RNA sequence: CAGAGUGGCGCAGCGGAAGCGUGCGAGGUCGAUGGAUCGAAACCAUCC
RNA sequence: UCUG
């Protein structure tokens, strides 16, 4: 058998001694010669298939040689194409031939799905009646037939004839429905075996027909077999368990076999009986039937194992995440936009942390990157455990270098020399390339090589040029593959992505939002939990500014949160105040005005809707915008807000597709959305909770979400403080967490335990909601919360005086969330 | 030579003399084979390429024979697959051999553009370098190739070398980079001149290489050739004649020529000169480059041409009415909808009239009909005027059958026997045929047969069973080609189908503009003219009763013609009244209302605007619906509309694409709104008209406009009346044509003398706006015909007692007209 | 435009099979691959 | 691969 070679970054195929040259090759024998070839071509066939490598041949001597015609033949017959360089490019040094392969197809999404086949073969084994001949369908012939049966005459006149004269002749030749052969003289039964597979498939592929064996097929006479050489029962036992050896496969119901009819007939001479003769209808079937299992190899574990007919027919005919593939070219441009002309170090907080606690470990790195002029060089603790694999001890970090006229190299810092240092980065080297061709669908000619570096004080493979990054275009295809990759996994880069993602998402939104603002003065926007209302809300009034050309302090923000107002005021785009602030000063500069979580606004104070319709209709330009931004799942009060009636709140526009949360979190958010509508608030008009998300609509980022009861608050202190260190390690920022509590008056207990519990974690600054822009870990309650949001967010026994609002509090906590969630409810 | 026989409805290619069967055809001298193969195959690419058509070969025997293993694989070759019965079949009577070709790809759009080349070739004379060998591309290699195109070494070591040495070893063997030749006699020159157009190629177009002739293969010595056979100018003059001889394309700029570099060494013998040996360097070049000219043919005229390299190149690379094409379906369900167990016979009208007209003809159609069971026929009075075709006097009419069963067929009905009636007969069933196929895109195997019948009292070829419509598939994707193809001439059909397209394109507008009702319940809509206003306007309150579930009567109508009221109050849908109506009425009852034509109402009355927000706003949902639909392009008076201010008309809803005209109509009122937008009238708001069309959109739907000045009003009068009768006759009913005057005062002169001429016409039936739904012309003044549209509009001397008023009057003539629009100014 | 590539060297076969002349019983799978044929060096195609 |  073929085995992968296991100390190698890359798929290795070692297949032995083989003789190359065309001359050395001719000068073998026929059976040797072919069975070199199909080592050869199983080995190549295999790494097509299972994305990519390399193919070790022994060769018997040091010169150079060419490869071979026949080898040649074989792998254009094999991508059916003349553009081997394409996918094959040759190496040797020394008694070493290298055939380095690319793979055929990359990605669980080519674009080529529905052009290309999914697989290459040796042989497909599916043959059809061409007219009078039989002919073996390649790769792609195979791919058409399989996708046309998966979507939902006077040869029967000798037919009927119970015996035969010999020398008669047939009135018809052969064509797309007859065939005529004549019986081996040497060995009939073997003979009947090796025909039937032949010709019965090809006639069940294309509308059936008749074979007549024992008719000279140049003169149409009737020959049959002598009676002395055949047994008749014995012949058609052996005809009919050959037709039901072939393997079939059915993409229908019912699921009948190959149905024909087989027919001895006798030939007579002079009248009396000569010989037999055998005729068979076949039947058209509705499927494909092959003449046996198809000569399809590929890499599984680490054996190059043939496929059975049902998986090809599977491959043949049929975490993944598909915003990361619609978006991969603004996630690259991002996060891994490569510059010109010197060489990045990402994410630069982990590489200063790095650097920081190790000593001589920049003088290392930038030891090894004086070569690369241009490129990335992508740092993590883990690259394994950011792949899904073991975490060992030892390795300080793990690098990737994607830098142009260099292959990429995928670095492991271990402070002490281990001996399982080269195991480990290999093994992460050959998880990522085969992540970066199966996952992230790259579709070039990729490899990344595993280099073990030290702190304290098998033999790589040269690859062709081809494999080196040539420049801007290649080095982006690559980085938006390894894009691809890290939204299915679990990693610091991979959460930024997420978050890039969650962006772009809301500027869709956006953008289809955007277009109210040409069509209302005054409008009413209901938001659903996670629908990017503020985000929406900072951007109208962005594009306020650039469209009524009015100066940015002319637009007002009325909010009725301090913390809330100090965030949208850090930004400068407008001015924003509190509804107390609003009532009480003078407003008759501005113009425009936007009030955002309206639901959590009160009357006490004064008319505040009031005052904004007359400020907005005293404006110069007719009368300004007045848009209300409100969200009644999000209710905190059940006072009266001081809104006009729901039936007075027109014009109207729905924000309702959840655009700030991972997945976990927008389907918690659905389904606490769910049970407020079961149970709505007094306060809140009867037809308010009536607006419904989108139905099929996902946020396709991956996020976290855990619950964690009956837990004390001194463990509940600890268990935070171990995550926030665990994420903290893995290079989270503090500014990425938020820790929020029932009610402002437990925000003080709950910080002096949270202290109490962080200062064995080496980090003892904690900060208020108001003061988001720092970096240290925000706590608060949930209610000074409102409009803020965080990656990761600790929710601390959510409770309130009503139990009616507990799901509305739980409702706004979970919102605050983008990506991680953490909830200790009472126990 | 081959032609294209004149007497059939198909494309049919008389190759002559072929011998056939596998044992005749191996009798055969190579060469007289060779040329049979070589004609059929000329006659088959030509049919491939040119939508399909027979050849027609006289063979030697009289029983049935096989084609020939030569010609199957030749076949096999040309279509790059084993699937022949896809596109070539086979039938013989007698002396004749008939090959049917279907098309290899049909239509200006197929929806393969992208995976297969449009033409098939004998051979694309492109060449790649592969490995050590030289291959030539197929067709999708090819198109594989010039696609990619199409986007805007220890070799060098002894090529550097001034001179070698007899039995040098060339440390290197052939490859992708490298070859070898070694001619060592007299005719080297020769030789090596027959060598450059078959590497120089295929090194140009795979990244270069290196060919040393004077190396042995074998050993790889350098041997060269003797001096007395070499004389190097006349060496060096016939391999750059040779080299610049290659015909080459370019895609790119500069289209420099191909680059290489060419050395003739001297061979030394022990320091002795002894011969030479020739060096060629060729470049990467920039495009493709042809050894010679691509073998594919094609019929064009009644030849069967070869394509050139640049029109094949692009073939390879590289009226069409789009909207059709994205319609079809629909279309066809619903003009061409095919009835379940019975024919049916379209257009119904022009049915009739032919067998009012003609005494028998009903008769002889209905006896011709009996073998069909289901199916549709489409008669015409002339399918060849219809196709851009020479009208024939005589022939009553021509009908189209489709009909399960049985083979597309083009009936011709003539008065009396005719010679030239059958050659009418066939050629307008090969253009429709042709365009069916061409045109319409139909993929499958058509043939379109043409019968001659007389109403007073060449042999047919026979099609394989696969060119009969077997069922409802087969006969919609033909009737879909058949409105594709339809929607592209001047036509009855064509101008139903342009009428459905129309109202396809509006519905697309109205689900876009339909939003607007959930999150309005104020709404001023600003349609520009032919915007689809009234369209909107009906169909919504259509849908207000259906969400609302009010009943009808609860929706209300305001408009200010008393054409448009009743036109509107037939529908059903609401009640309808005029403006002066609803101010003197009570309307208590009423929910909802909706005003049109806004821009047109006046203040004298009252406060209609106010009433309207008054019954409105105390609805049970509510405050009710109130959209008032308006155009101010289509303003009619230089008086206060009683509208509120332009600043007070929000929201807002905009229908900027133009749903309701064809394209030329679209144009023209495009270009008159600009007019507009140069002078507004001072009643008119200041900045109401900057709304603008939308900037890509058109139609894609054929139409009219004919402007006819320097005329008298008897001229008027015989050009409308003469254009009427012209489309009564064509089919088209009175009630798709309108006659609009300026003034109603001018409506009865004009009246008496469309009469003086219509009188001569046979039709003495006329009508005012307010009897839309009759079967008469309608004749009016334009403003008494708002609202209102006809497929065929004549605009008479259109004229107001103001210029104030001037320019509104031919934008509100324009929009009235669906696809025929004429106007005769004054002169 | 055609032809050739079978014992060290030169060569005949022309649908059932490995032989002749030279060189000394030995010496080749009939240039390679694929195809048709019940069946080949022999018929067909492509390639070197 | 070579030859006429
Ligand atoms: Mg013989
Ligand atoms: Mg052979
Ligand atoms: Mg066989
Ligand atoms: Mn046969
Ligand atoms: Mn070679
Ligand atoms: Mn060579
Ligand atoms: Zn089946
Ligand atoms: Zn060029």
């Known amino acids: 058998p073929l085995v992968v070679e296991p100390s190698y970054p890359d798929l290795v195929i070692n297949v032995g001694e083989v003789t190359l040259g065309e001359e050395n090759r001719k000068k073998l024998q026929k059976i040797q010669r072919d069975q070199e070839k199909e080592r050869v071509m199983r080995a190549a066939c295999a790494l097509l298939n299972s994305g990519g490598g390399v193919i070790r041949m022994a060769k018997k001597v040091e010169h150079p040689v060419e490869m071979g015609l026949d080898l040649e033949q074989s792998l254009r017959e094999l991508i059916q194409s003349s553009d081997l360089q394409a996918f094959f490019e040759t190496k040797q040094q020394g008694r070493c031939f290298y055939i380095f392969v ?8 080519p674009e080529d799905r529905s052009v290309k086949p999914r697989l290459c073969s040796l042989s497909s084994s599916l043959y059809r009646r061409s007219e009078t001949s039989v002919r073996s369908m390649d790769s792609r012939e195979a791919f058409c037939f399989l996708k046309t049966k998966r979507k939902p005459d006077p040869a029967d006149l000798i037919f009927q004839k119970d015996y035969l004269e010999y020398g008669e002749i047939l009135p018809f030749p052969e064509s797309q429905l007859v065939e005529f052969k004549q019986f081996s003289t040497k060995h009939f039964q073997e003979y009947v075996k090796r025909t039937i597979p032949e ?5 069940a592929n294309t509308g059936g027909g008749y074979l007549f064996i ?22 058609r036992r052996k005809i009919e368990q050959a037709i039901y050896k072939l393997p079939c496969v059915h993409f229908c119901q019912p699921q009948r076999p190959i149905t024909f009819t087989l027919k001895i007939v006798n030939v007579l001479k002079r009248g009396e009986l000569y010989g037999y003769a055998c005729m068979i209808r076949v039947n058209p079937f509705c499927c494909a039937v092959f003449s046996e299992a198809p000569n399809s190899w590929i890499v599984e574990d680490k054996y190059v194992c043939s496929l059975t007919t049902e998986k090809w027919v599977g491959m043949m005919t049929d975490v993944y995440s598909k915003k990361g593939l619609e978006h991969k070219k603004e996630l690259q441009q991002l996060l891994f936009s490569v510059p010109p002309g010197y060489l990045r170090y990402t994410p630069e907080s982990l590489w200063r942390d790095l650097i920081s606690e190790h000593r001589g470990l920049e003088e290392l790195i ?3 990157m004086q070569p690369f002029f241009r490129g990335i060089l992508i740092f993590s603790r883990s690259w394994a455990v950011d792949l899904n694999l073991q975490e060992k001890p030892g390795v300080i970090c793990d690098a990737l270098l994607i830098a142009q006229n260099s292959t990429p190299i995928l670095y492991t810092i271990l402070r002490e020399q281990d001996a399982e240092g080269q195991d480990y980065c290999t093994r992460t080297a050959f998880t990522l390339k085969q992540k970066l061709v199966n996952m992230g669908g790259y579709t070039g000619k990729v490899c990344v090589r595993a280099k073990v570096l030290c702190l304290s004080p098998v033999s790589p493979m040269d690859y062709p040029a081809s494999y080196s990054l040539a420049g801007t275009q290649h080095m982006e295809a690559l980085l938006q593959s390894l894009v691809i990759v890290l939204l299915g996994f679990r990693s610091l880069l991979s959460d930024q992505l997420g978050c890039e993602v969650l962006n772009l998402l809301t500027a869709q939104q956006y953008e289809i939002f955007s277009r109210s603002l040409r069509k209302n003065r005054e409008l009413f926007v209901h938001g659903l939990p996670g629908s990017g209302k503020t985000i929406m809300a900072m951007k109208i009034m962005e594009k306020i500014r650039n469209v009524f050309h009015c100066e940015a302090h002319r637009i007002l923000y009325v909010c009725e949160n301090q913390p809330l107002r100090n965030f949208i005021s850090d930004r400068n785009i407008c001015r924003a105040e509190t509804r107390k602030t609003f009532l009480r000063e003078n407003f008759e500069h501005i113009q425009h005005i936007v009030i955002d979580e309206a639901q959590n606004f009160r009357t006490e104070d004064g008319d505040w809707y009031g005052k904004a319709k007359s400020i907005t209709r005293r404006a110069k330009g007719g009368p300004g915008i ?3 931004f409100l969200d009644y799942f999000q209710t905190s009060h059940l ?3 001081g809104l006009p009636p729901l039936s007075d709140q027109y014009p109207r526009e729905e924000l309702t597709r959840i655009v700030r949360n991972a997945d976990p979190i927008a389907k918690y958010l659905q389904k606490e959305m769910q049970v407020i509508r079961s149970n709505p608030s007094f306060n809140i008009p009867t037809g308010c909770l009536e607006v419904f998300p989108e139905a099929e609509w996902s946020q396709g980022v991956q996020g976290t979400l855990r619950i964690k009861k009956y ?28 820790v929020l509590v029932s009610t402002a008056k437990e925000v003080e207990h709950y910080k002096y335990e949270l202290l109490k519990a962080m200062r064995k974690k080496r980090v003892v600054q904690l900060s208020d909601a108001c003061d988001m822009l720092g970096d240290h870990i925000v706590l608060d309650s949930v209610r000074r919360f409102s409009g803020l949001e965080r990656s990761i967010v600790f929710g601390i026994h959510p409770r309130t005086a009503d139990p009616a609002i507990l799901p509305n509090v739980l409702i706004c906590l979970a919102s605050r969330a983008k990506q991680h969630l953490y909830i200790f409810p009472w126990g």
């Open 639 to 641: 006072d009266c807000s």
């Open 199 to 203: 010709y019965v498939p090809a006639f």
């Open 214 to 235: 024992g008719v000279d097929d140049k003169s149409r006479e009737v020959l049959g077999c002598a009676k002395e050489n055949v047994d008749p029962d014995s012949l």
């Open 102 to 109: 690319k793979s055929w197809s990359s990605g669980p999404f």
């Open 366 to 368: 930038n030891k090894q």
């Open 711 to 738: 837990l004390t608050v001194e463990q509940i202190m600890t268990c935070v403080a171990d995550t926030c260190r665990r994420f903290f390690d893995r290079g989270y920022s503090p500014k990425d967490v938020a």
């Open 626 to 628: 007045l848009w209300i």
